[PDB]
């Protein structure tokens, strides 16, 4: 079942021998390949100089994954939502690769205990301020790691002391704290996000049984406002928690409104 170069356990894939290959491990009965890949809790690539990119397709089979390590290899970038289907993934080691940048949104569904980003060729930018922030608040063990980024003039700055102006977490407001509505009537809530860069904003409210419409009120610079309208409200949505989120490249904030219907 195991691909060559690697040593495959029942719950472990280790590919530490040097390798010119650029294809993520694929064990090899479409029902069986899924079953075998579930039981894997730990993948460890190392010294794969030509492994440049990591797709979501590569990861999606390994649903039981808890530990991913792609160390000291050629890794340039990770496709968005790569780790979507790897919910148990908590230890990630991406040190020693060719990463110039990295998005927090890769890890938005995960509860990372340890994210290792040491010795990558990071370039200073707003795109990586989130790392600086995680580092400050002691998130995912970045606080212990010594991380630098590089300015265009080749200056190497410690990440703690990165200074990018107009590059902050978004702030978020909502028109109502809680919401009371009579069954059959309509209702309007407005959520706005503000900051730099200008955050996207969304009412993550799909599980709602009622009919609902979303409309952008403003997109002036620095404020983004969206207006959730609930039409002909069913009482099946009593006690539902309407949540709005505002994200930019720095991070994410949210607000919650309790909906009560009678």
């Amino acid at each position: 079942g195991c691909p060559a170069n690697c040593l495959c356990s029942k719950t472990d894939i280790n590919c530490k021998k040097p390798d010119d290959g650029n294809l993520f491990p694929l064990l090899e009965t479409s029902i069986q390949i899924t079953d075998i890949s579930r039981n894997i809790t730990s993948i460890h690539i190392e010294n794969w100089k030509n492994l440049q990119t990591l797709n979501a397709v590569d990861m999606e089979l390994y649903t039981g994954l808890q530990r991913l390590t792609i160390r000291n290899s050629g890794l340039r970038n990770i496709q968005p939502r790569a780790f979507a289907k790897n919910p148990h993934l908590r230890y990630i080691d991406l040190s020693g690769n060719r990463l110039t940048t990295l998005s927090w949104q890769l890890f938005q569904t995960l509860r990372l205990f340890d994210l290792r980003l040491e010795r990558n060729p990071f370039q200073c930018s707003c795109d990586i301020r989130w790392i600086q922030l995680w580092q400050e608040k002691g998130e995912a063990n970045l606080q212990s790691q010594q991380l630098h980024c590089m300015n265009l003039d080749t200056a190497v700055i410690l990440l703690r002391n990165m200074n990018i102006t107009q590059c902050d977490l978004p702030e978020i407001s909502v028109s109502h704290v809680n919401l009371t509505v009579r069954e059959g009537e309509n209702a309007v809530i407005t959520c706005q996000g503000s900051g730099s860069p200008l955050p996207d904003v969304d009412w993550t409210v799909a599980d709602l049984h009622s009919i609902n419409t979303h409309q952008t009120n403003l997109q002036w610079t620095n404020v983004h406002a969206i207006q959730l309208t609930l039409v002909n409200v069913t009482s099946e949505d009593n006690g539902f928690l309407l949540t709005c989120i505002a994200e930019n490249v720095v991070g994410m904030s949210q607000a919650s409104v309790l909906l009560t219907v009678y």
């Binding site: 294809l23 090899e28 089979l61 996207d200 799909a206 979303h214 952008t216 969206i226 490249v249």
Partner: protein
């Protein structure tokens, strides 16, 4: 030397709330042009192809009315700059007409050895009888540029005759007609190699 011309002009899309809509544009000329679509959001993803001379605007999950709009693809090189438009309409689940495309069977996870045949499955219904097209990794699959290796089946499936490393990816079928457009949930094709 030659200014930019559009060989793929994007077409209007009537999508359904919660689902997906794609717009495709692609330009050509000398020098090679760079195309581009016109707030930064996970729901709006631009996928580039052909060294940036083509680009697909993928919008998902669709929200209404907010996403409804005219969108602009702009091809540009040293000799010119040209623009094409396309509209997005987004119907709610309750607002869908009776004959709005519906995916009755979507594609499924498939693994296949290199050089073997692999057929990704799709079956759709609606009125008019919907026309089916495929999308591999958010870009549209073009059976004519194979050539003869990849075949669009009558029933709607996609037949890939000689499996290749490049054929691996996330496939999804798209049923569409005058009433609108509906995406299947996605399915991955893996290609084992030795």
């Amino acid at each position: 030397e030659s200014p930019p011309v559009f060989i793929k002009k994007p077409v209007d899309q009537i999508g359904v709330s919660g689902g997906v809509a794609s717009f495709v544009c692609q330009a050509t000329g000398d020098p090679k042009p760079r195309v581009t679509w016109n707030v930064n959001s996970q729901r709006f993803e631009t996928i580039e192809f052909d060294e940036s001379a083509g680009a697909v605007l993928r919008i998902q999950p669709l929200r209404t009315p907010r996403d409804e709009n005219i969108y602009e693809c702009v091809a540009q090189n040293p000799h010119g700059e040209v623009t094409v438009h396309a509209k997005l309409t987004v119907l709610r689940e309750d607002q869908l007409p009776p004959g709005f495309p519906n995916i009755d069977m979507g594609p499924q996870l498939k693994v296949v050895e290199r050089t073997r045949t692999a057929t990704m499955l799709c079956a759709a219904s609606g009125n008019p009888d919907p026309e089916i097209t495929w999308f591999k990794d958010f870009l549209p699959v073009d059976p004519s540029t194979s050539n003869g290796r990849i075949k669009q089946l009558r029933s709607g499936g996609l037949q890939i005759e000689s499996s290749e490393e490049t054929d691996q990816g996330k496939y999804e079928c798209v049923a569409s007609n005058s009433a609108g457009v509906r995406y299947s949930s996605p399915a991955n094709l893996y290609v084992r190699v030795r």
